Design a binder for these strands. Structure first.
Ligand code: MG
Ligand code: MG
Lengths: 239, 239
DNA sequence: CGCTACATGTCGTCC
DNA sequence: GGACGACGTGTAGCG
């Protein structure tokens, strides 16, 4: 219980209980390979029949159950959940959330492996190429939109909704920008169109809105044009 | 190598290589506990400094790096990535993706554990309480909306966008339904408003929009009412 | 394929 | 905690 890893293949019940309870107490990552059934009831409800999966319980209460395919866990519980090991006909991992109230139950039919990983990580992800950096680029360099553009507000609450960037053009009109870091879609335009209408109701048909994205879908283009909105091609920047 | 699980702690390089290789060849699950750095370049770009993480490679190319917090992996590749282990100053897990071009590099500074899990699973998640089931309820029992409501289409592409349920009321108006399995937000009302307008272009004032959800956010109700759109409380059914 | 919209979305960020 | 919208979103499902 100093070693980063403690692992037992084909553990007995006592061994399982010992390692599971150590993981929670030491606040380390618990990892288990097991044949299991999963029961979930919560926001939604689901059953998963008997099969082999990887189970992870993070010290912050995150609970993940992974099949041999996809990116997503087949079942999970978010940070803050409370997990208890519980003995029955078979051992059962039980994770509870109260807000909203959700129960995840993992019945462990055969545990092939259980492990405790006392992980030491002080580092945080450093990410670039986001929408937030698109905004920064525009405020530092407003001409990537158009000559004379004057960015004024970032994330301005208008009446209903929140606008990515609000500014004025060389004609003095109010300008709404809707930024997308990737190819913009129908819902991008609906967002932009929604902000613009609300603002037009105040400042007149004067108000411009501009979709700022590396590209558009066919449908985005269509709706953008039918509503008299504009498109400025812009790539999300990378430090 | 007929055991369901193979585990090596503090492996040698050749031990590391052997198990990774075997994992990929056997369509097994690879799990690694390691101190590592992560370099990602793709749709966006990111850097993660030295820290302990759980690393998972699924047979379908899904690649997950997990820290001891949250529910999301800090770095990943989705199914379809091709992974390989390169011997550099340290071993490096690579994982290239095509369309779009993405590379994920995991530098293994110290591998505390490597494991091969030959997982056997034929079962698919059975979930209830979804939006699809709201839809099915509404076709089985249209009076949950209102009497004389006749549903016609589900997931119907109109010109721009795809409508959840489309039908008529007993007064001969066209009805758009927008469904949400959870509390409805501004996004939903924007969808609904958008569909109603497009439909009004063909059929004129004879279109009704209805938001169907268990409840609304403040802004949603604000926008709903402003636009003369309706609301019917409905909870997603659980079998 | 490209487009669209759901999701037990999750997560940040303001209030 | 509710509201609001981003995310390297993932993922289905249909043209
Ligand atoms: Mg926005
Ligand atoms: Mg919809």
């Amino acid at each position: 219980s100093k070693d980063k890893v403690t692992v037992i293949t084909s553990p007995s019940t006592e061994e399982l209980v010992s390692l599971v309870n150590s993981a929670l107490l030491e606040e380390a990552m618990l990892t288990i390979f097991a044949r299991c059934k999963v029961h979930y009831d919560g926001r939604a409800k689901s059953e998963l029949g008997s099969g082999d999966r990887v189970i992870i319980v993070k010290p912050d209460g995150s609970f993940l159950i992974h099949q041999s395919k996809k990116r997503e866990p087949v079942n999970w519980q978010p940070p803050g959940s409370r997990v208890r090991l519980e003995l029955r006909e078979n051992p059962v991992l039980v994770s509870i959330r109260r807000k909203p109230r959700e129960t995840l139950e993992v019945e462990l039919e055969e545990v092939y492996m259980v492990s405790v990983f006392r992980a030491e990580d002080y580092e945080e992800l450093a990410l670039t190429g986001s929408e937030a950096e698109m905004a920064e680029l525009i405020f530092e360099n407003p001409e990537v939109i158009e000559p004379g553009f004057k960015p004024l507000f970032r994330e301005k609450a208008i009446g209903t909704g929140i606008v990515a960037v609000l500014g004025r053009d060389s004609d003095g009109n109010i300008v709404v920008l809707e930024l997308k870091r990737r190819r913009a879609e129908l819902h991008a335009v609906r967002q932009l169109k929604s902000y613009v209408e609300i603002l037009r109701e105040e400042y007149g048909d004067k108000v411009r809105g501009i979709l700022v994205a590396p590209s558009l879908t066919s449908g985005a283009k269509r709706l953008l044009e039918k509503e008299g909105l504009e498109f400025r091609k812009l790539e999300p920047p990378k430090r």
